[PDB]
Design a protein around this ligand. Sequence first.
Ligand SMILES: O=C(/C=N/O)NCCN1CCCCCC1
Ligand SMILES: O=C(/C=N/O)NCCN1CCCCCC1
Lengths: 540, 540
Amino acid sequence: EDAELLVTVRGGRLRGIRLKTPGGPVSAFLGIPFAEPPMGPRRFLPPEPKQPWSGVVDATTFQSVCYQYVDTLYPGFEGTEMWNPNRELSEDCLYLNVWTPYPRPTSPTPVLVWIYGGGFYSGASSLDVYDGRFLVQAERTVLVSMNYRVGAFGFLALPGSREAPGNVGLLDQRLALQWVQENVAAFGGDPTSVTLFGESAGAASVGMHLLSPPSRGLFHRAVLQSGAPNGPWATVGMGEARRRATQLAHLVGCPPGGTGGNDTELVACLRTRPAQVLVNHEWHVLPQESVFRFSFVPVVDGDFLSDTPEALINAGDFHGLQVLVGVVKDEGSYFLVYGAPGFSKDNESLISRAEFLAGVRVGVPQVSDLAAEAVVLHYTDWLHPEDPARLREALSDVVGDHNVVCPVAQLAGRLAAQGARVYAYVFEHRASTLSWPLWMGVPHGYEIEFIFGIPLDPSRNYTAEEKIFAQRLMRYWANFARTGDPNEPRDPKAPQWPPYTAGAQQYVSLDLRPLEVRRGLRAQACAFWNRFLPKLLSAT
Amino acid sequence: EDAELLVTVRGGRLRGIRLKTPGGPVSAFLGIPFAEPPMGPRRFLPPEPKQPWSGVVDATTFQSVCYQYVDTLYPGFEGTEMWNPNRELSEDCLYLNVWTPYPRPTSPTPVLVWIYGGGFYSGASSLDVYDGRFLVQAERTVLVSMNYRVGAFGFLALPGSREAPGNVGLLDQRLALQWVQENVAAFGGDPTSVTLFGESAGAASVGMHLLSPPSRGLFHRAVLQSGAPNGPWATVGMGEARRRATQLAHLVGCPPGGTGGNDTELVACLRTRPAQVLVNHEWHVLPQESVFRFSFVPVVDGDFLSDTPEALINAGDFHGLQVLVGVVKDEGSYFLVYGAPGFSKDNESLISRAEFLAGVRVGVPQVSDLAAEAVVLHYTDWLHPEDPARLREALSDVVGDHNVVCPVAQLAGRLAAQGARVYAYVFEHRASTLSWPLWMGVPHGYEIEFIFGIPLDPSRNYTAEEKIFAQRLMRYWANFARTGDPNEPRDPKAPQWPPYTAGAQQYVSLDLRPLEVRRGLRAQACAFWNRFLPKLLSAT
Ligand SMILES: O=C(/C=N/O)NCCN1CCCCCC1
Ligand SMILES: O=C(/C=N/O)NCCN1CCCCCC1
């Protein structure tokens, strides 16, 4: 009863809240502090563990969202507002949430840990689409989700220095994983069966924890949804990260005119600026106009990432690891209304040939003109080279394959061929309540609502098929969290999900229809990005 | 009767022979001299018109074949020896043949002029597969075919000199066209309706006469079968042509060590060598190991070709011209047994991945390593990158597209978009009597026997459907020769053959089935060869 809403952890006591679902109640503990507030002199520093507290911390509501840019491209539009912060912004944001079934599991239960995306510049665990009450009720697992510092507060890096080493947002996630190992048993969760799953930048974060030894021991399975650490947007070099941090300091008047600009005096000036001031100049440090590019992302520093993600993936041994990867059908369509010429969510975006050629330079930023010609060659239907509809779908494939599909396929192939058991999927169901235009198809990020069982919410207008389809996906994710295999171990009737291998390259399609096995995650398109295009740049 | 076998031309009197067909007799005049024998001091010189003769020249049999290399790759094999000379070799070979229907047409009849192929190093108008008795009988047209000098005797060029200017083999064809304008009326032919049609190097020759003003006035229609003048094999630069001519001279002891080596002394030494000696060292002149490359080809000298064929095609007005172009289904499979590793006509040629990678360098001779990577990328099925059968068909596509299909498609597109009406086809029928292995499919050059109605020969074992198929093809070629349109001028029952345009790119498939309209002569593959690869070669 109400006694299950009281839980004692290593830091102190907590009071949770009961959440209602159409199938039964769920105990939730929202806003658990796992770190000291990274404010004042702690800005840009790695997180410190939350010191124990006296009394009962109220864990009945979500805590504050980390300071981040708020999207204003389409004010009042559900498709964009659903990702904006739904709580007040604050640097005091290092809090996590725990959903546990009712009654509380008496036996150790596998744990799912969600890491939200948002290009490492935005996101929050309090968003309605991340509501874990339906996944926990239907599958009786323990779900944990944490907040981590985004933007400059989480990834501004002056490499080599000590006042701003970078990757502190990744250390926020690692500390939350250490908190799960020390306290998830109090909620009925098994710390020996922890499955990380995230989307976009969260998926890239899950991949970077696979490549970091201090983080690898905190979990046992990984699910990467529409993201990978080896993408062209997930990491930056030490020289570029220093240029962006110095440019942001210049934009906010750091250092004051006539003062030396070493790393100590530069970060000290940054720590005196209000948090909103740094956010208002975050986008003004990118090197060129582009889409799917972000200012402050994880940096290859030799510490958290001893080498580039590509180098660590190639030289890595992943025996004893189960991975679930996948993408949506239209990964790049969402990002085209953020810079590609001739695109608009309120029309058909029937772009011309000239707009397609210009959009390639925005979708593939800062590459040689010869490299851009190779992209146009592969993504042009030369039997209909001027068809606006085909060009619109072509540029969507350019951005999606370059940033998501091919980095994921590259990762999935190296993982399976080096010990790991990999399962791959392609999400091909467009939600009936999707507010984005029809030409975007199945946009990036809109499989999350089905993984979290949002169609089960009675206050929403999802169809009856989508409710059954959502329960299938929650079954897939939970079975992978329990056994490392998305297939139901009791049911040979259901169509089987074959593992992904570097040779067969088998994957399944996720939609209202039963499972369908296909081969190749755009093998022809991803051979251009992963094999030839690097050689075309090496010769310049 | 026998009176129609007697014909007087401008040079003198001729006696022909009556040829029998299952549908009626045909009057033939084989071995008509149209030029002085290019022997002795006339070697390497342009042809001179045949001086008038006394008495009756016997024109009842084919004359001598020009000196040329004889294929010895598969001795005793029908597939190769059907192209070898069937008459004695001699430099006295400039003779032409005329087939005219019986009874002789009283009205002017459209004239077809055949130019044989053979990589500009071999070929003869006396070959059995060029027998024009069936095309002339079934369609009541006048057919002319000539011999032209091949190899060094026709295309050895010391550019600038007067002793060996090059392209004299093309001038032999031009002189034969001037002979048709002056004498084809005596056989019942119309000198105002002359249609050139050729194959491989013959098709390239037909294209070069389109781009040469002195030759363009001698004909009115053109048919290019599996060849184009803009191919990477049909022409050679002035510097490379001088190196090959000097290397051939060195191989035969010219100049005698150690005397001067100016162009006059070099050609004088070459004219003293027996003709067979020059032939025996022809293949030891090419720069690298390759297939679909030939030693002595037309040279871009500024005379016969004022510029490169590519430049003349782009900056040319073709209004009032009707062109019929096309290719066979498997253009490159025949050339793979002539140098590609792992290939053999007597096995399945299931090559490995390494043999495919090495074969690309032979099929695409002397390109940058980066260019070879681009070819490997485009022609590799990255879902089955090691499948021997797919690699065999891939290398066949590499050679066929690079040398035939894409040069033809580039030509057909420029002709259609600049005034000329173009009809395109793809020959997809494999002859039931074909001696080449099954994996070659429809090899290069094996549509000729159907164009000339060879299945109508009662001494051969063609099927009943192939006889009907050959008759329908002869009607297509004759209708184009008569009216400029391969379609039936009045029959609406049979499906129509739409023209080829640079936008729609419509073509028809020629096989036992009725006409089927398709779009794009391998538009995706040929965009790589015609658009992207030249830019990759510019930026080395
Ligand atoms: O969102 C902005 C704000 N600029 O001030 N610019 C475009 C960046 N877009 C939006 C961020 C994720 C989608 C692709 C990249
Ligand atoms: O036939 C020879 C004779 N070499 O001495 N070599 C193979 C090169 N071939 C020759 C012409 C037929 C296939 C195109 C390239």
